[PDB]
Amino acid sequence: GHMNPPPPETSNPNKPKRQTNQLQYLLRVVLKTLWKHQFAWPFQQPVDAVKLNLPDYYKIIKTPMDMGTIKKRLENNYYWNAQECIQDFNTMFTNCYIYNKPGDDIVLMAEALEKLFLQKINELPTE
Numbered sequence: 656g657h658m659n660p661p662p663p664e665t666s667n668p669n670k671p672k673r674q675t676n677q678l679q680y681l682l683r684v685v686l687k688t689l690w691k692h693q694f695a696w697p698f699q700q701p702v703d704a705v706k707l708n709l710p711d712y713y714k715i716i717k718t719p720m721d722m723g724t725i726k727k728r729l730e731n732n733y734y735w736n737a738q739e740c741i742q743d744f745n746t747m748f749t750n751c752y753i754y755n756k757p758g759d760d761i762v763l764m765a766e767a768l769e770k771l772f773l774q775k776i777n778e779l780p781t782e
């Protein structure tokens with residue numbers, strides 16, 4: 656039958672990780688600002704291709720990422736540096752633009768969240 660893939664890991668004892676003021680800002684300011692946006696909801700958890708009737712999603716998107724995963728990674732101090740976390744946000748946005756049709760509602764939502772994201776990481780503290 657239909658199935659979702661296992662979600663991205665939010666812990667890995669053998670991964671190198673650190674706490675930095677930039678990673679604290681990425682949770683406290685960036686993630687928590689985007690999370691409260693009226694367009695956040697499709698991005699707050701891994702895509703449930705079964706319940707959302709998107710059977711092609713994991714045929715097209717092979718590096719899934721979502722803000723639920725990013726939130727848990729930040730809370731778990733999973734990252735080595737801010738760049739690793741920013742890369743996860745960028746993967747999430749890129750996947751949306753690859754999978755969905757330009758001008759569709761999901762793309763308008765991603766565009767609005769990405770506009771905010773780009774503003775917020777411009778005020779990333781110097782480490």
Ligand SMILES: Cc1cc(S(=O)(=O)Nc2ccc3c(c2)CN(C)C(=O)N3)ccc1F
Nearest residue numbers: 697698702707709750751754755759760761
């Ligand atoms: C805004 C919106 C959402 C949904 S849905 O949430 O019910 N299904 C859904 C439909 C498409 C997507 C996603 C969810 C999530 N996602 C990250 C993505 O890239 N595409 C369907 C139509 C639609 F216009």
